Design a protein around this ligand. Structure first.
Ligand SMILES: Nc1ncnc2c1ncn2[C@@H]1O[C@H](CSCC[C@H](N)C(=O)O)[C@@H](O)[C@H]1O
Ligand SMILES: [Zn+2]
Ligand SMILES: [Zn+2]
Ligand SMILES: [Zn+2]
Ligand SMILES: [Zn+2]
Length: 472
DNA sequence: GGTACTCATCA
DNA sequence: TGATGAGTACCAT
């Protein structure tokens, strides 16, 4: 129902198509992903819209031009100016068409001038796509240039999105929707390359979140023992307790099996050598239904959720680099444990996390549920659970949300007993720096009874729009 | 139907 | 570094 959720699910569907095209090794799988979205009538906003799109807030970060196409936010994958064609002329009979609704500024036009709240934006045309990429002939008042002129004359604002470079390993560039701007005036003049260009002076409208630019409270330098490949610092700027999240608690990197929990028969595994790449020859690809569930992109991303993923294991002939061991690899991201206002400790990332990336296995002591307060994860892909109450990895610090950005994935690798699957958290969405990582704990309402005559209730503080207000 | 256009993306 | 990329937008040589 709710538009932010619609946007989320559209973007997840695009990400699925994208990764499937990457697996098929198709040219420009981003664009192919869009074509698949069009075929499936899955473009969220299939017609042009003036102003804001519901579910797309000012500040929204897009991870490719293609994503913007998938949502319907900006319909060309290349073109800087998106406008209503003459098809829209009866719908908007009092405006003069064409009429622009969205522009992208990515530093490609030498005449562009970016001063944040004020922008001088170059029209389209005569722009070289090959070479030093300069203007190579005069522009005229046509196409997008006309569209922008009409915006100026009819007081129709345009959405403005900026491309930004990232020094991250996995995402090279991001596009931020920076809000509505009015087209104040336009004119022709000689550009820096000596040919005529049209220029559009844009001024950011008020009534919007401010444009923004861009270790305090450290309580522990690395909550792992140096056991994670990337250290995980902890902070507390909520109060000044000097207490670390590690007090009382022993960080571990591998599961601990309680003595009365059975150790199932080891998986037979595959006979591939080095890395598994041929899905015909690989028994582990066969277990998954014939294809690998992970794609070899950004050190391994899960294409889509499954009842269970079958990874290579102890007896496979392949080494640790195998893409079908994706969730077994080193922590890829710089993370931080921080004190939340009302949920206790919480986890966020300092880096971008691509959708489908593994975040972590839930590590703790595996116990029979019959033998077992707030750090237990039942394995239900329930006879067995993972207890991180006294020992575990960082997973136990991740909070619940009614609108999460991580999801739970069961993985079999050491053995084939589904009751004892590994529990692994993957990014459901593309996650930006400093966003809290969360998953849905999945408790039923009124499942919990206090030791007396009361249903026991626990308030949710996830802050989501559709919060429902109770963990249970 | 025919096609000129184009502010990305790939190590 | 540049070759490709595909959904138009508009005319229908
Ligand atoms: N969305 C949410 N709202 C309120 N409390 C939450 C919450 N998500 C997690 N919690 C709290 O965190 C517990 C899960 S363990 C998660 C780590 C915990 N926040 C800590 O400080 O160690 C829950 O029992 C609950 O007390
Ligand atoms: Zn393998
Ligand atoms: Zn194999
Ligand atoms: Zn294998
Ligand atoms: Zn909630």
């Amino acid at each position: 129902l709710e538009p932010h959720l619609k946007v989320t699910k559209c973007l997840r569907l695009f990400n699925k198509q994208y990764l499937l095209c990457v697996q098929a090794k198709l040219s420009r799988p981003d664009l192919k992903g869009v074509t698949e979205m069009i075929k499936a009538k899955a473009i969220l906003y299939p017609r042009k819209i003036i102003g804001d799109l519901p579910g797309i807030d000012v500040g929204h970060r897009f991870f490719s031009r293609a994503e913007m196409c998938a949502v319907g936010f900006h319909n060309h994958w290349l073109n800087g100016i998106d406008y209503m064609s003459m098809e829209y002329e009866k719908e908007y009979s009092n405006y003069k068409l064409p009429l622009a609704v969205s522009i992208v500024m990515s530093g490609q036009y030498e005449d562009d001038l970016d001063n944040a709240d004020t922008v001088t934006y170059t029209g389209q045309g005569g722009h070289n796509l090959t070479g030093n990429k300069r203007q190579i002939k005069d522009q005229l008042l046509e196409r997008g240039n006309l569209a922008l002129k009409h915006c100026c004359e009819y007081n129709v604002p345009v959405r403005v999105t900026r491309g930004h470079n990232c020094k991250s390993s996995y995402t090279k560039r991001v596009y931020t929707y920076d809000g509505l701007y009015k087209v104040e005036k336009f004119w022709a003049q000689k550009g820096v390359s000596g040919f005529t260009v049209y220029k559009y002076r844009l001024k950011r409208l008020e009534g919007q979140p401010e444009l923004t630019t861009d270790i305090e409270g450290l309580v522990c330098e690395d909550i792992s023992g140096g056991l994670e490949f990337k250290g995980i610092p902890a902070t507390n700027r909520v109060d000044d307790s000097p207490v670390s999240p590690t007090s009382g608690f022993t960080y571990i990197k591998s599961l601990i099996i309680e003595p009365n929990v059975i150790i199932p028969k080891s998986s037979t595994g595959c006979n591939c050598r080095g890395s598994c790449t041929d899905s015909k020859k690989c028994a582990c690809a066969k277990l998954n239904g014939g294809n690998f569930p992970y794609v070899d992109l950004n050190d391994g991303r899960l294409i889509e959720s499954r009842d269970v993923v079958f990874e290579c294991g102890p007896h496979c002939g392949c080494g640790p680099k195998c893409v079908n061991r994706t969730s077994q690899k080193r922590l890829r991201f710089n993370l931080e444990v921080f004190r939340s206002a009302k949920k206790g400790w919480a986890v966020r990332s300092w880096e971008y996390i691509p959708a489908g990336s593994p975040v972590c296995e839930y590590i703790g002591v595996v116990r029979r549920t019959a033998d077992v307060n707030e750090y237990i994860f039942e394995i239900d892909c329930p006879e067995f659970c993972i207890d991180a109450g006294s020992t575990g990895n960082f997973a136990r610090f991740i909070n619940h949300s009614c609108e999460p950005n991580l999801f739970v994935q069961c993985v079999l690798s050491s053995h084939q007993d589904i009751r004892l699957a590994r529990v692994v958290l993957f990014a459901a969405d593309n996650i930006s720096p400093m966003q809290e990582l969360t998953y849905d704990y999945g408790y039923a309402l009124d499942s919990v009874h206090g030791p007396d005559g009361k249903v026991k209730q626990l308030a949710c503080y996830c802050g989501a729009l559709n919060c429902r207000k109770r963990l249970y």
